Homo-oligomer: A and B are copies of this chain.
């Protein structure tokens, strides 16, 4: 191994410590990362985290005292639950530094996207960065004994600025 080396720094950035680091490793393992022979890649956990985040965001929007009407609920959800915004948040919280892959093509797309985001429509969005925003939510869920509340404790702080920005002026 060197597989889990360095993960403590990520845990500090999102403020969550894994009990079973295998979940965190799985979350960050791309299908091309053949050097990880101890867990699967992140796809199963992405499948799970995807629905988890959809539910948590939906619930938050539904409960917001601003009492959005249905068309607005729908627009807000569309704008907060999509691969592009999930990627932008992943790179904002350094997920790309712990991602594991073997892909010069991913490197290129991620690198351009990360640069472009820091200076902030035809920039290519790296879908994998959105996918690990989802997979990590799944990992946290699984690590905490299937606790939605733990996931939201971690994820709400990262999403709150866009939630507030969009809920004041809906795209």
Contacts and interface: CB of A to CB of B under 8 A. Distances in A.
Contacts of A61: 47
Contacts of A59: 48, 51, 146
A120 to B, nearest CB: 29
Interface in A50-99: 50-52, 54-55, 57-59, 61-62, 70, 73-74, 77
Interface residues of A, number: 20
Nearest to A47: B73
B58 A48 contact: yes
Nearest to A45: B62
B77 A62 contact: no
A127 interface: no
Contacts of A77: 47
Contact of A58 (B51, B62, B73, B146): B51
A43 interface: yes
A70 B43 contact: yes
A22 to B, nearest CB: 16
A81 to B, nearest CB: 9
A44 interface: yes
Contacts of A57: 51
B43 A62 contact: no
A76 to B, nearest CB: 10
B74 A62 contact: no
Interface of A: 43-44, 46-48, 50-52, 54-55, 57-59, 61-62, 70, 73-74, 77, 146
6 contacts: A47-B58, A47-B61, A51-B54, A51-B59, A52-B58, A55-B55
